[PDB]
Design a protein around this nucleic acid. Structure first.
Lengths: 204, 174, 203
RNA sequence: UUGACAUUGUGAAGAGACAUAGAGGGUGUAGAAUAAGUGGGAGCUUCGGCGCCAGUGAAAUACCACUACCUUUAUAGUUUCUUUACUUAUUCAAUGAAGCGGAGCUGGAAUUCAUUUUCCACGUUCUAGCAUUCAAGGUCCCAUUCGGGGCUGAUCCGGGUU
RNA sequence: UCUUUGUAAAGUGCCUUCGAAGAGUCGAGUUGUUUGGGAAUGCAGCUCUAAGUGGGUGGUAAAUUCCAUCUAAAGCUAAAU
RNA sequence: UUGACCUCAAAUCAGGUAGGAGUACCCGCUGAACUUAAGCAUAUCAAUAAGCGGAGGAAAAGAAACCAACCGGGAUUGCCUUAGUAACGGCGAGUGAAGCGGCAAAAGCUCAAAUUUGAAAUCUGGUACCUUCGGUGCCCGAGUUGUAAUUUGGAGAGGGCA
């Protein structure tokens, strides 16, 4: 059972000595192939925030650059173009739309590398900016499958009590298992090495 | 060894099953008693004889009623008794592999026994029982994993041994 | 109870202990005669579920049978017939070797009666079985109603008429649709359907 | 006749990789800097120190981990090969299964580098004779009868007939 | 018709805890034979070798998923013939 | 040194038993060929004849690891029928079952696997006596590497209550 160990719970709270927001990290284990279309290619809604700081480079257009002055992080435009291609790196993830898809060929050599842009997997160019901003400032997870076999993500903070973090590790177990393709093996819950950022690893 | 065997067989000479004359005597006793005192087989006392027989002993082990189990270094269909070390180690009952089913025969008034077991014991010899349990557990039950790792046999014959050792001496040393 | 342990141990054959015991015993049995007396059942479980009750009268014999196909006679290979029937080397002898063991000890201890038998051991040259014979004239078995049916004289040589354990297999007698050539007996079910039945008032 | 599997086991070599840890290794640009990749992330340690930031590049670090990449087996059992070594299976042969194997005992080749480090011997060759009675002798018994017994003569040890 | 052998044996209602069931056998590959049995009906030689909500059968091979039926690898028994 | 155990033998040991005959029916093994195919090599004759092993008044089979796929039947054997059918087959010549239905006869069950453990409660043999195809007492043996009762798949066991 996931109750004897911590795995999201109260048991690992005094093991780390840093009194800063240290988030818990869950690692899935499933042998896949080297291809890019297989695996769990989905980023769901995380119901409790991961408690991270992230600012959004909303480079919007006429119909969508008005809902950023109420509940957002930064208000940008498409005219400010000579900053996000040469010097500035003060960002964590952006958020775009479908109305302007000809500016995307310009911010690729600087922001596609450290995951500051969008290519094909994360819901960054979503049009709706009046309801999806109650989901991105409550910081989500990071489901990104690597080359051979690992899936490193983040669930919540270890200092958060076991009451908010009781339906979050359960709703995340139902995403890498049910959007699963048929290039996955038996017992897809095979090995879950869960360590936050500083202490020991607690596995099932 | 001979010391613990001597102590163990003094203990079992104190506890023998009923022979024919004893059974006929207690038959006359209870034939008097049930006809006169009408005690439902309780005018006779509770027995304290040694439990024995192989299916009997295995049942007493599986129900954890045994205090001590003895086993022969014998019977030629060996699959009869190779599981009793594992049963006694699995159920925590102490056990010792005594030499000869002949001696186990003579303590039980039979020819061959191949097992013997104490389940009850009177209050006179609890300490001697516990001392024997301690010595046996020092010998047999606690070395069980290590002996389970050892591979017995393989000792060459002495002509082959002497030829081996001379060839090994003249090849590495002089 | 401790025949369940012997039962399950004997089910684990190629494990290291049983292949040690199998090697010592194939050596020992190969150094004795072809048919000789077993003083005690080497497998009390497997003898015991075939009808052994250890009292006066039940006898185990232990028996080596030569192992393989049946090189036909008719010397220098010539069968004198159709090339349908011109084989020698590959013909396979419809009775099992377990049946041959039972039949040979039936002839040698002719006073006794075979009951069943069981495998014990094999190398490439030989199979070794043990037969579980009963002495029917002994007074411990002429009484004791669970085993006195052997005393009736219709069971003289059950081993030679296929009436034992391995006989009724080798006759193919079971129920089923897979035994229609031999279900009540092969030749009775042959003869009842090559017989032209004629009535008086011919239908 | 030739092959494969079975009968068919046990030691000692050479490579393929697994229980089981860890030291280290892994230098195309840029970037304090050898970032094989990823996750958390603005801070930790008494302090120092690094880190956030800054800047960079496809990859931003202090701090804890996973997959990995080339070594390192020191710990345990399996592989196909070395043809090596084994005796217990199987095989062959001989004997009224008679003297095997090891150690010692004298001599003696042997030269001593401390004292023996060594190996060979260890009852019969002029003769168509003889060789048999628990063996004569020696030594201790027994109860001296007339005789019997034990040890040695014929070194012990392991019962593997060789 | 003489004993009444019996404080023996057996039957049945409810509840609980259980519930042991047959291996070099089953099954399989091959080989010979056989059968109406046809990607193999039975038997037998060899080689491999099981399982336990399992095993077999369900007359076309196989993967996958239900369903029904029985319980093998021990044994006895008249009459219709 | 005596006493046991295992195992293996020998006795004109005690007491038993197997052998051969018949073999028409029954259970197996082994196994042709003439023949048919208007030739002949698979086929057919034929799972036959001859050979060999083994029984009885019948043997054998038998209480389902079955038949079905139904609204389900229920051990075995036999007859009538399915049926010269499905199926096999140089798809030639030929070979060729079974379930369902109607009757005949109807019959069920037993071991292994569960410690009786406040009691091997079991049995052969020898002897004494007798209401001597057997019964009772006693004594040696067999046997707890396990005999009796209990249970056998449909149930059944242990407890508890009426």
């Amino acid at each position: 059972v996931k109750e004897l160990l911590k795995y999201s719970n109260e048991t690992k709270k005094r093991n780390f000595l840093e009194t800063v927001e240290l988030q818990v990290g869950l690692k899935n284990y499933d042998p896949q192939r080297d291809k890019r279309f297989s695996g769990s290619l989905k980023l769901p809604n995380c119901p409790r925030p991961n408690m991270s700081i992230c600012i959004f480079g909303d480079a919007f257009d006429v119909d969508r650059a008005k809902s950023c002055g109420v509940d957002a992080m930064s208000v940008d435009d498409l005219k400010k173009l000579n900053k996000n291609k040469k010097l500035i790196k003060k960002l964590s993830k952006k958020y775009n739309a479908f109305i302007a898809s000809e500016v995307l060929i310009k911010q690729v050599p600087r922001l596609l590398g450290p995951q500051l842009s969008k290519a094909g997997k994360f819901p960054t160019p979503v049009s709706h900016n009046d309801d999806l901003y109650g989901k991105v400032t409550d910081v989500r997870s990071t489901i990104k499958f690597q080359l051979k076999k690992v899936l490193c993500l983040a669930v919540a903070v270890g200092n958060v009590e076991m009451e908010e973090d009781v339906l979050v590790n359960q709703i995340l177990m139902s995403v890498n298992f049910f959007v699963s393709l048929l290039k996955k093996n038996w017992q897809n819950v095979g090995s879950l090495v869960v360590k936050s950022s500083m202490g020991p690893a607690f596995r099932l | 060894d001979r010391n613990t065997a001597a102590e163990t067989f003094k203990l079992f000479n104190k506890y023998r099953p009923e022979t024919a004359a004893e059974k006929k005597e207690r038959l006359t006793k209870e034939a008097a008693a049930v006809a006169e005192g009408k005690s439902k087989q309780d005018a006779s006392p509770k027995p304290y004889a040694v439990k024995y027989g192989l299916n009997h002993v295995v049942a007493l082990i599986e129900n954890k009623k045994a205090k001590l189990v003895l086993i022969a270094n014998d019977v030629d269909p060996i699959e009869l008794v190779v599981f009793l070390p594992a049963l006694c180690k699995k159920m925590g009952v102490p056990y010792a592999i005594v030499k000869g089913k002949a001696r186990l025969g003579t303590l039980v008034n039979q020819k061959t026994s191949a097992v013997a077991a104490l389940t009850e014991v009177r209050a006179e010899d609890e300490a001697a029982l516990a001392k024997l349990v301690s010595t046996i557990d020092a010998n047999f039950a606690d070395k069980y994993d290590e002996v389970k790792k050892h591979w017995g046999g393989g000792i060459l014959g002495n002509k082959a041994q002497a030829k081996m050792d001379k060839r090994a001496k003249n090849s590495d040393s002089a | 109870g401790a025949y369940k342990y012997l039962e399950e141990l004997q089910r684990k054959k190629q494990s290291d202990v049983l292949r040690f015991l199998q090697r010592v015993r194939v050596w020992e049995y190969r150094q004795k005669n072809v048919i000789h007396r077993a003083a005690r059942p080497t497998r009390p479980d497997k003898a015991r579920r075939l009808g052994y009750k250890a009292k006066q009268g039940f006898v185990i014999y232990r028996v080596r049978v030569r192992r393989g196909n049946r090189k036909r006679p008719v010397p220098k290979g010539a069968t004198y017939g159709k090339p349908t029937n011109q084989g020698v080397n590959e013909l396979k002898y419809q009775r099992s070797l377990r049946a041959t063991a039972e039949e040979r000890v039936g002839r040698r201890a002719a006073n006794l009666r075979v009951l069943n038998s069981y495998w014990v051991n094999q190398d490439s040259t030989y199979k070794y079985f043990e037969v579980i014979l009963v002495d029917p004239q002994h007074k411990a078995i002429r009484r004791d109603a669970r085993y006195n049916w052997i005393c009736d004289p219709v069971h003289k040589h059950r081993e030679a008429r296929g009436l034992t354990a391995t006989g009724k297999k080798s006759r193919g007698i079971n129920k089923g649709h897979k035994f229609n050539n031999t279900k009540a007996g092969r030749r009775k079910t042959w003869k009842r359907q090559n017989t032209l039945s004629l009535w008086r008032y011919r239908k």
